């Protein structure tokens with residue numbers, strides 16, 4: 031009906047349809063702490079919310095009241111819980127509620143309660159038909175919204191909507207190849223569909239990632255993804271990768287490439303590689319270069335790696 | 346060396362300019378935003394250098410104290426958005442005061458105790474305010490606040506029997522916990538539950554069955570931990586995950602190697618502070634969520650007998666973090682912030698200070714090594730890496746509650 | 756200055 035900012039808005043304490051119930055003031059005690067000096071409108075709505083909650087009034091007026099309580103503080107999870115109790119008790123049209131939560135999330139996309147409420151509605155309706163498009167709109171405004179990506183992964187996994195997600199991932203990587211949330215979604219999609227054990231798939235991914243690295247050498251996300259899809263089997267299991275990186279080193283001696291080389295050497299030494307002494311020496315040299323010049327912010331980490339290597343492979 | 350009135354800074358070294366972002370001539374929203382922050386930060390850094398004269402940095406303790414003292418009593422309507430997080434405000438403010446070694450008057454302490462009692466739910470746990478349903482976030486905050494006060498009055502406010510029943514009412518079969526009845530699930534809940542359960546001595550053998558395994562599923566390809574299995578590595582969720590596993594004595598469930606490499610990579614080479622996710626902006630609050638992981642990892646590796654561990658430093662640039670917090674995160678009017686250009690708030694005041702404390706103090710076994718940048722008065726009280734309240738408070742609380750039995754269990 | 760959007764719950 032009428033919104034909190036509407037010119038005709040009337041305080042609940044002045045509404046005839048609410049005269050039959052007494053408001054319940056919040057009791058902060060005689061000597062309050064972290065006491066918020068609420069506006070008259072805020073206190074009015076919550077004094078009546080406390081009233082309906084205390085009486086557990088499952089009514090249409092109570093339902094409308096929660097809308098105002100939510101506008102005042104969308105992070106009040108108690109109000110949201112009560113609103114859901116009312117949605118069921120009053121048998122409210124859930125599609126209408128979906129339109130409502132859509133608008134609310136657009137306004138407060140980083141709120142935990144609004145996303146959970148939406149998930150509950152989708153679960154109750156078992157209808158994910160609007161999800162991918164809605165989430166895409168939110169991500170169009172903030173491509174890294176954590177809540178949006180989390181909801182997206184849930185919808186895709188729960189309703190098996192994998193078919194077009196890799197295409198979506200490719201689209202967003204074209205827009206911003208530095209978007210780590212998208213690289214994570216890439217792993218999410220592949221690991222849950224084809225998997226990375228298919229050598230044709232792995233080669234495709236390694237080639238793609240290397241191409242992205244060549245285009246933007248200092249983009250950490252691509253480097254992390256490359257390591258991510260190869261680490262479990264062991265970086266030393268891919269001999270050609272070492273050679274390729276060693277060739278780019280002279281022209282692309284970024285801390286990411288140098289660190290990756292150390293990671294390869296670490297794994298090589300862990301798998302009884304040949305020329306152990308030479309590999310250890312090369313690894314220690316790089317750790318020093320990283321600690322003293324190329325990645326000084328991580329001096330302590332690189333010094334640690336150096337000592338670790340010596341504790342494990344000195345012989 | 347240098348006279349006592351001049352202290353060279355890492356962020357002011359001539360070679361530090363080489364740490365500026367290299368966008369490879371390929372601009373995207375990410376690089377554009379990162380470049381904007383670096384430009385502002387360089388301006389800030391330069392304002393603390395006068396050629397070879399570099400005055401010692403100063404933590405404006407008094408300004409922060411007055412800001413905190415006022416907030417503990419009253420807040421403007423600007424905090425209506427936190428009306429369901431009042432125990433958080435109690436914790437953020439009390440912990441900040443604790444770190445600053447500012448005494449809490451007995452009267453104020455009792456008032457906080459009485460208020461949190463009003464926030465406690467009859468079903469167990471604490472809500473965001475009087476009469477609100479219980480929720481693990483304000484429950485975690487309320488318990489920490491009561492432990493910071495540390496009086497028997499504060500300890501006894503907690504209804505332990507109902508608290509354990511409440512935790513049971515949130516436990517899922519896959520090992521995870523809901524944040525509240527009918528609420529969302531993510532790794533924050535596992536930490537909130539483990540934190541309050543361990544401090545109050547209410548852990549049962551079945552309470553956390555499967556929880557360590559669920560948390561491990563949250564560690565992803567990046568090495569960090571996401572909110573739920575499959576999600577992007579995030580500093581806040583990673584702290585929750587590792588801290589919870591440390592409480593459960595199940596840190597080995599994770600790949601500590603990839604975790605260590607991931608968190609150390611989150612410290613910004615130029616700014617000195619930490620980002621919450623790869624390729625995102627620096628933020629003072631991650632000074633705790635991210636840097637706090639290093640003491641936890643140190644402890645974990647030390648328990649395994651790692652012969653390469655340092656006996657004097659955490660595995661992150663302690664000085665650079667202090668430089669970022671002291672030069673970029675202090676509001677001249679009191680309070681701390683996310684980054685230059687952002688307004689102060691109690692949350693950032695709490696975590697920027699918590700992170701500063703971690704950066705100043707190293708401890709392992711019988712070894713203690715402090716690195717307090719700036720004037721000596723900058724030294725903060727230490728904070729426990731698992732609970733983020735004073736270590737003395739942790740010991741006092743755990744000792745007190747260990748004298749009580751686990752509710753209805755032998 | 757602008758307010759930080761960081762929320763814990």
Ligand SMILES: OC[C@H]1O[C@@](CO)(O[C@H]2O[C@H](CO)[C@@H](O)[C@H](O)[C@H]2O)[C@@H](O)[C@@H]1O
Nearest residue numbers: 262561562564565566567568599600603
């Ligand atoms: O950081 C990688 C490390 O995490 C574990 C969990 O402890 O697995 C995560 O990462 C794998 C990719 O490397 C994913 O397949 C898996 O789903 C995710 O949980 C460890 O197995 C791994 O060594």
Ligand SMILES: *C/C=C(\C)CC/C=C(\C)CCC=C(C)C
Nearest residue numbers: 482533581582585760761762763
């Ligand atoms: C900008 C800061 C944000 C979004 C907060 C991130 C931190 C967390 C999520 C961790 C929450 C931890 C607890 C509730 C104990």
Ligand SMILES: [Zn+2]
Nearest residue numbers: 628630683761
């Ligand atoms: Zn922050």
